[PDB]
Amino acid sequence: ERPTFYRQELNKTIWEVPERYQTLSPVGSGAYGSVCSSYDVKSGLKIAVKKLSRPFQSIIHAKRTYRELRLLKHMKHENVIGLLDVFTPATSLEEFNDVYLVTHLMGADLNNIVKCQKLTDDHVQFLIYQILRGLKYIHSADIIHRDLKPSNLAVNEDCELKILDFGYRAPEIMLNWMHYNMTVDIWSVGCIMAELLTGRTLFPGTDHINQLQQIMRLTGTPPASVISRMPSHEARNYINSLPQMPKRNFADVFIGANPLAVDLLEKMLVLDTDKRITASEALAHPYFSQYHDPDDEPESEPYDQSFESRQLEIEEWKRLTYEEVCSFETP
């Protein structure tokens, strides 16, 4: 049965939400859609409400809309943002033209978590452990489109963590993405953890290619196999040798740090993509002895993404979307 809806204008756009979602307040926005904090009277919790920007303008917008709705529906893990409600003021498919997604509200982005200065080792243990627990689960789903990453992490005031869904190209580039999508994740975590222990950026370049040179001061130079197939000799020269800079080592960089943190980082911040630590291995590490529960670290159910390779008109995506909204049982 359709609940009483109520209508209001926030930042020059019309919001029509169910009775339960009171005291809407705009927190921020991006291309995807606008978000509002709201007090859900029913369950008595401060909540997040998103209204999608023109969800069925184009095929891309339409599939994008359906994708996010399917993903947050599937994501059921205490470290990954999940769908609490989805709704529309529309009462028929023809009329249907406005979609709202509802989740829990996290209060602090990554870029605020760093500056959130006074952090005990325990907070770091907990934060990193949660990203890893999330990551294990996220990798297990094999999500074709990439919306969940470590950098999208979000944190409410007691350090409880969730990974949100935000925060001409040659084939060899995107094949490389697929190839290393899990490895790069654990590099991000590594960088993130480092910043939580020091408060400074770990690998600051003058630019992105100079960034590689910085990384290697800690990681060492690539294996012969990687170097011997660079497209030129001057390319090999750039990655087969460090220039003579002052010597820096892990023990130096993370001096005040719990030595187990330094151990963990020495297995995360490794250049050899194969030798680098995997998420579920990283969980078993001694640094997380408090938190590590091998039977409380679940993988995902298979996730049917056959939709990703269907080529459909706008109206076909809109129908799929509206079928999901009407099917949704609010937990």
Added chain:
Amino acid sequence: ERPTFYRQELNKTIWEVPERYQTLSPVGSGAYGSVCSSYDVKSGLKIAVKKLSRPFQSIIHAKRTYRELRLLKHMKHENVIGLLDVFTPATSLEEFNDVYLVTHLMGADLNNIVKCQKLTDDHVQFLIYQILRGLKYIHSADIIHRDLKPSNLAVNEDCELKILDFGYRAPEIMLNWMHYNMTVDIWSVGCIMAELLTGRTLFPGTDHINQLQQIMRLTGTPPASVISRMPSHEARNYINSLPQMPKRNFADVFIGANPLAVDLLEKMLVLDTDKRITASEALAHPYFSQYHDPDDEPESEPYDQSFESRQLEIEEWKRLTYEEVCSFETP
């Protein structure tokens, strides 16, 4: 001997330019600096004058400034933007805080060449020949920092073309950049040529990973070697099979096109990075039979980029820059 400088305010910023550069008119801008068209009285030609944005604010701005000055100083090829003049109103290193760079003016971006509707096949031969002549020269300079790209091409009205210098990361990503930096270039050109012949984007995605699926429709699926080392079986499944969409083939897509144009594209738009045609091979190809001159397709002089590996304070880069400004002889 310092010429007479004159001063004016253009877009709330003070421009001080030598007597010869009259009738300054702003055309466009980027984070690097703002650009003006100007009538150079001396050589009597419409010219481009760029004023660098706060060139010595930080180390990055300072090295950046120096790099661009070294690059365009080194680049001497008629398909690659080159430095005609660099100047400063400053008369001592302590004063020195503003820098201007002068090149030829083009007046048509890539995104303006597409829509430039009625183009003979001749225009395409000539446009594509010049990018390839460029790229050969560019690739041969082994330029550590990437500012010169196919997509950065610019054109004047008689179809004369020049490549301009504008248009947390894991090591495996940038290592990959280095690896394929030449092969991706030929992919871009392939894509550009395709559009020139048709007017539609060749590989339209819904998103970037979906684009790989679009590409494979034409290129087929990756070799077993590329497949057998994806990080999951679901990834293996994405790239080991096309889904059953309409069959599409090169001959179809480029129907009205010169058949030799199609031949070249079937050698450019190849997935296997090794089999893919190289810039210099693409030159020798029958499609540019009238333009191809193997003794007029020069490689670069070595380019001393030892500076890219130096860590220097702002003031050190500012002196190198100032030294280059005073040393420069205007052709």
